[PDB]
Design a binder for these strands. Sequence first.
RNA 1: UCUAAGCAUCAGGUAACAUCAAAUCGUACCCCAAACCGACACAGGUGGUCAGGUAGAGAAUACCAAGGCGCUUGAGAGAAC
RNA 2: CGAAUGCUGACAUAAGUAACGAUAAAGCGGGUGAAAAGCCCGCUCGCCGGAAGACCAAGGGUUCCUGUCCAACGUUAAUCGGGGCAGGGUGAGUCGACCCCUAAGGCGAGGCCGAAAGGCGUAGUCGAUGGGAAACAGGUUAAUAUUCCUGUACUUGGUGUU
RNA 3: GCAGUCAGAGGCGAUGAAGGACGUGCUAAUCUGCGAUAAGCGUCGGUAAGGUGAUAUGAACCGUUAUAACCGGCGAUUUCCGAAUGGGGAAACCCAGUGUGUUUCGACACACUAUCAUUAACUGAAUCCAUAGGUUAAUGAGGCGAACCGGGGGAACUGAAACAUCUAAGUACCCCGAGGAAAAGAAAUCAACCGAGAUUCCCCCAGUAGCGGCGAGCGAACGGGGAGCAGCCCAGAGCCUGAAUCAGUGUGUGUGUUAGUGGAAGCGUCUGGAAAGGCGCGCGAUACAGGGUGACAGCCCCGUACACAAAAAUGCACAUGCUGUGAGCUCGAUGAGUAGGGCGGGACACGUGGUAUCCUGUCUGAAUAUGGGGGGACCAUCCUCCAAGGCUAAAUACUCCUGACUGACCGAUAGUGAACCAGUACCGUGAGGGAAAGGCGAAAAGAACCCCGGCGAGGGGAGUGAAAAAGAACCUGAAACCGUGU
Lengths: 62, 77, 94, 46, 103
Amino acid sequence: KAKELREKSVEELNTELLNLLREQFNLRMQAASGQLQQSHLLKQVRRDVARVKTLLNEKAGA
Amino acid sequence: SRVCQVTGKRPVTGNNRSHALNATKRRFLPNLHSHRFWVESEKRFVTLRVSAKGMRVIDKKGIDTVLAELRARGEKY
Amino acid sequence: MIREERLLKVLRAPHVSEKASTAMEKSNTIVLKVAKDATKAEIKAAVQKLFEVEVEVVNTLVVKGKVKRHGQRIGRRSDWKKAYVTLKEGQNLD
Amino acid sequence: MKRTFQPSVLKRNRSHGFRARMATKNGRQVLARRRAKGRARLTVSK
Amino acid sequence: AAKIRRDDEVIVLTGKDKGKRGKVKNVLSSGKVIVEGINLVKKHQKPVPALNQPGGIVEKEAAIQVSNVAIFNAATGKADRVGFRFEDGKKVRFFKSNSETIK
RNA sequence: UCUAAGCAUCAGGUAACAUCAAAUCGUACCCCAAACCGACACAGGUGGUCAGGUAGAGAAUACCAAGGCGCUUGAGAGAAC
RNA sequence: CGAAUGCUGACAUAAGUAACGAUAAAGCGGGUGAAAAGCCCGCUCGCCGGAAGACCAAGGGUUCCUGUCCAACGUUAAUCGGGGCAGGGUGAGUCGACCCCUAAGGCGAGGCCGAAAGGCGUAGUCGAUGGGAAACAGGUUAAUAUUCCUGUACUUGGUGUU
RNA sequence: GCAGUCAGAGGCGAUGAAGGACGUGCUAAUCUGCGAUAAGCGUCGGUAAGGUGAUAUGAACCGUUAUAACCGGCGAUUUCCGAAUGGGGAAACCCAGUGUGUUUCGACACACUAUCAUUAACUGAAUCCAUAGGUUAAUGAGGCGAACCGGGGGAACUGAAACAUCUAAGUACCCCGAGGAAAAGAAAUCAACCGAGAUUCCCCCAGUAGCGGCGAGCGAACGGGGAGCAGCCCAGAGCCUGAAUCAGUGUGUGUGUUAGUGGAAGCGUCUGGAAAGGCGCGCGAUACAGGGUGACAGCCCCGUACACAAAAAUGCACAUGCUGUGAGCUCGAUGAGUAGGGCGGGACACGUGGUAUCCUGUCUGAAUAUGGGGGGACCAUCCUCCAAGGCUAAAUACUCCUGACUGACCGAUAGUGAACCAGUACCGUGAGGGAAAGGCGAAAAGAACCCCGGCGAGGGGAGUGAAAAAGAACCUGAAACCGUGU
Ligand SMILES: [Mg+2]
Ligand SMILES: [Mg+2]
Ligand SMILES: [Mg+2]
Ligand SMILES: [Mg+2]
Ligand SMILES: [Mg+2]
Ligand SMILES: [Mg+2]
Ligand SMILES: [Mg+2]
Ligand SMILES: [Mg+2]
Ligand SMILES: [Mg+2]
Ligand SMILES: [Mg+2]
Ligand SMILES: [Mg+2]
Ligand SMILES: [Mg+2]
Ligand SMILES: [Mg+2]
Ligand SMILES: [Mg+2]
Ligand SMILES: [Mg+2]
Ligand SMILES: [Mg+2]
Ligand SMILES: [Mg+2]
Ligand SMILES: [Mg+2]
Ligand SMILES: [Mg+2]
Ligand SMILES: [Mg+2]
Ligand SMILES: [Mg+2]
Ligand SMILES: [Mg+2]
Ligand SMILES: [Mg+2]
Ligand SMILES: [Mg+2]
Ligand SMILES: [Mg+2]
Ligand SMILES: [Mg+2]
Ligand SMILES: [Mg+2]
Ligand SMILES: [Mg+2]
Ligand SMILES: [Mg+2]
Ligand SMILES: [Mg+2]
Ligand SMILES: [Mg+2]
Ligand SMILES: [Mg+2]
Ligand SMILES: [Mg+2]
Ligand SMILES: [Mg+2]
Ligand SMILES: [Mg+2]
Ligand SMILES: [Mg+2]
Ligand SMILES: [Mg+2]
Ligand SMILES: [Mg+2]
Ligand SMILES: [Mg+2]
Ligand SMILES: [Mg+2]
Ligand SMILES: [Mg+2]
Ligand SMILES: [Mg+2]
Ligand SMILES: [Mg+2]
Ligand SMILES: [Mg+2]
Ligand SMILES: [Mg+2]
Ligand SMILES: [Mg+2]
Ligand SMILES: [Mg+2]
Ligand SMILES: [Mg+2]
Ligand SMILES: [Mg+2]
Ligand SMILES: [Mg+2]
Ligand SMILES: [Mg+2]
Ligand SMILES: [Mg+2]
Ligand SMILES: [Mg+2]
Ligand SMILES: [Mg+2]
Ligand SMILES: [Mg+2]
Ligand SMILES: [Mg+2]
Ligand SMILES: [Mg+2]
Ligand SMILES: [Mg+2]
Ligand SMILES: [Mg+2]
Ligand SMILES: [Mg+2]
Ligand SMILES: [Mg+2]
Ligand SMILES: [Mg+2]
Ligand SMILES: [Mg+2]
Ligand SMILES: [Mg+2]
Ligand SMILES: [Mg+2]
Ligand SMILES: [Mg+2]
């Protein structure tokens, strides 16, 4: 979604980077117990942190 | 080291040939002394570790001419 | 104030065990699985935010990994860090 | 009976360790030999 | 790059099952297709307590080389081969016999 | 504890009270030993600490307390050596 | 290739012979089990007791504790184990290290010295085996405790007051 | 693995290396990959129906006409240790200072701070001017890596049938500094009365002339044939003024490089587990290089000869704008503690000899174009040359690495030590030493089910397969060695 997140701001991709990490915390605790039978969701959020961290450095002086 | 500071002489190596022509390794050291030179333009003394062949060069060229060569060499005094 | 991005990395899992269960029903203690470079002031600051529950004191220890054998080949498990977070009175946790 | 190997980790490390093998011209050539040979454990140091 | 694909109808050229037409079911990365119905072998399947299999002597499909089949031509009724040309600026495939496009 | 540069109506000093903080690492188990040093589940080697009773000069010695052990092939027979 | 007290692997012989590692010592009943001289429980007997008990440092590095397994390992059998496999277990302002300070000694800006590499050394900076703040009693786990809990304390710092 | 041929590339590093430590998965370990954005992120191209690295199944998912996955260009992110560079240290650890922004006052984040060198400004002792010194700045260096290269030091065993001169040998080894090559290089060089015209390298000359306890040994030049070719500047004033050459930056423009694209032509019968084989009848070839496919394939598959391709970054070339450097004429200068010499050694094929020439530790010391060097002791004549200042391409040397192709090279006790998770296990305090171990089958179709046994080990059936004395202790299955039967 780096095509789509490019139509955002540094104000948003600090809020957007902060909601994936809330989401990542609730997936890791859910997979700690036997309560996550969708383990394709750990990989999706971790790959989407990287797209937002990339767009923060493209904006900040690149 | 045993290095003359104007000429650049240095210990060199050779043999002690005996009467039966046995060769053992020796060195040849340079005739180094230390000496204060009065420099008239700067109005001070300069100590240099210089050979007796090098004290004879300053007799010929002059102390101002010699010290210019050691600055352009990059050597400190 | 520790940044909100550091508080979301300090906690890893809850530790499940008989000793970990006993302190929850006796000493009001949750036993967590934390990061290895976490510190007692961050273990206190991430339970008091992400779980919304007050903490009295934190007791940490580092657990060392075991040497196992994959048939003929030797290998070792990683070390990890283990916290005993003491809750306050009337403080129940999801 | 007392045998020749009496271990001590501090004296293990001061005499044969990585920071000892870097403090001299010859000790650095011991490490350059063991890198071109292909040693997995390069020093005494854990 | 590939000639034989997922749901082609092939015809086997060598083996114990030479000559039988049939639909391909998948293609593996080792250069081997598993074709539906053809290369049937019997495996003495071992039952397990979990996973809910009764376990017996199951007959199932075994992987045959891609080189050992060929795309059956429906119009001629024979084994024919596959070429690569470009139509509409897109890559297509056609039969080496009669030069007509696979569609 | 004493002052000097400095600072002088600020610091700083020190008596009470209130308050916050004390991080990080080690911590199991053996340790005169079957876990350390001796190729061995090897009668060998290995620094400190604690020191009950009766007899006794005694931390010797004999028998015991607390505590710990019977030493990882046994069964017979009852010759020479 | 038949030989070099040749080189490597396999396999004989002696020979089912010597040996099974302190002469501190065992007996029986019950249990478990496919199987019990050796494991568990019970009762007796013997040995240590300035150690063959208990607590550490150094060194080791999970041998700890529990469940399961007996191929190999254990000088015999093994249901047992410091063996195999899986899980659990080490909680500190006061204990120790770190940190502060120095000894012997080490390194050492410049410096002086030396074919090169290098040597010694001033200012300094490291280096304990020595100096420098403070917690006790009781209770609790299968396995940690001066650390957990109960009772009762003490110590050094930042802040704000008057 | 080993030996080569042809062509690239000839470095990497403070923009943090080589080599590591620790992390990183739906993951318990190890391997490869990656670095807290952690088997990966963006972008630009290639390509696509199949994918999510290995042992190695499973689970949870993504994708099919284009941001699934893969391949390449340029980017992003890149923990800790290591020259490690803020201080220290028992590598992967321990402790900060300063400045800047936030702070629910408990505290967080980011940046900077080694040393040396040169340069610059501010300052600044004895001591008046000064100067040593002091403090900030900018720029550079440092470490590692195969051989080749140049220089500073430099053995002994051995041979001499002993051994000391001599040999081995300026070899082995240690150290400093480079570069893609280095070094050398434009005659104070040879020749011989005729002439050649810098250096390097190959072949002759030639085991020659000589040197040599005249022993063992060491060993040229002159001249000839080739490879390759190249000549210039400064010790300096006028006239000309940006014209000769070289690099740098740029740009157009070729040619490579780094992903790729199409690529011909065969069937019937026999044996067989299985046809590529046999036997018939055909077709392709600018492609019968090679490899795979259930036995031996030009025509089943991958390719091969041939024909096309690049958004982007880049190498060697051309052309063009460009800063600096200056051509050409003109008169003039012509490298002094230097050449030679005495003494002690070293180099020359030449061991001090009748020994020319070169270098210099020591002591001395010219002439200067009317002058000086060499022509193998030395002298006269004649000839040739101009030292004491620099620069310079090609031919020559080498391979850690890259790619393609080859072998009267090896085939597992061989070839690397290592075909296999090998510089590993293991041994040593350390430096260092250092293994063994390859093959089921075409495909796991890897033996459901029943039986003896301890819910054992192991075996007997059954079934799979062409084969089960191919059953994982697996192709073949020799000998020693040990048994049962006659
Ligand atoms: Mg000699
Ligand atoms: Mg507490
Ligand atoms: Mg702790
Ligand atoms: Mg303890
Ligand atoms: Mg004891
Ligand atoms: Mg024993
Ligand atoms: Mg013993
Ligand atoms: Mg008797
Ligand atoms: Mg033989
Ligand atoms: Mg013979
Ligand atoms: Mg023999
Ligand atoms: Mg026998
Ligand atoms: Mg017997
Ligand atoms: Mg006998
Ligand atoms: Mg006997
Ligand atoms: Mg006997
Ligand atoms: Mg006995
Ligand atoms: Mg015994
Ligand atoms: Mg009994
Ligand atoms: Mg017994
Ligand atoms: Mg008993
Ligand atoms: Mg006694
Ligand atoms: Mg173990
Ligand atoms: Mg135990
Ligand atoms: Mg157990
Ligand atoms: Mg048994
Ligand atoms: Mg046994
Ligand atoms: Mg055990
Ligand atoms: Mg203390
Ligand atoms: Mg020193
Ligand atoms: Mg110095
Ligand atoms: Mg000191
Ligand atoms: Mg100190
Ligand atoms: Mg101490
Ligand atoms: Mg102390
Ligand atoms: Mg205990
Ligand atoms: Mg996969
Ligand atoms: Mg340092
Ligand atoms: Mg540092
Ligand atoms: Mg320090
Ligand atoms: Mg000799
Ligand atoms: Mg000799
Ligand atoms: Mg001799
Ligand atoms: Mg050059
Ligand atoms: Mg001439
Ligand atoms: Mg193609
Ligand atoms: Mg083709
Ligand atoms: Mg085929
Ligand atoms: Mg065959
Ligand atoms: Mg001159
Ligand atoms: Mg001379
Ligand atoms: Mg002379
Ligand atoms: Mg002489
Ligand atoms: Mg002279
Ligand atoms: Mg001359
Ligand atoms: Mg003559
Ligand atoms: Mg001259
Ligand atoms: Mg010249
Ligand atoms: Mg081999
Ligand atoms: Mg073989
Ligand atoms: Mg070998
Ligand atoms: Mg070892
Ligand atoms: Mg069985
Ligand atoms: Mg075969
Ligand atoms: Mg066999
Ligand atoms: Mg045999």
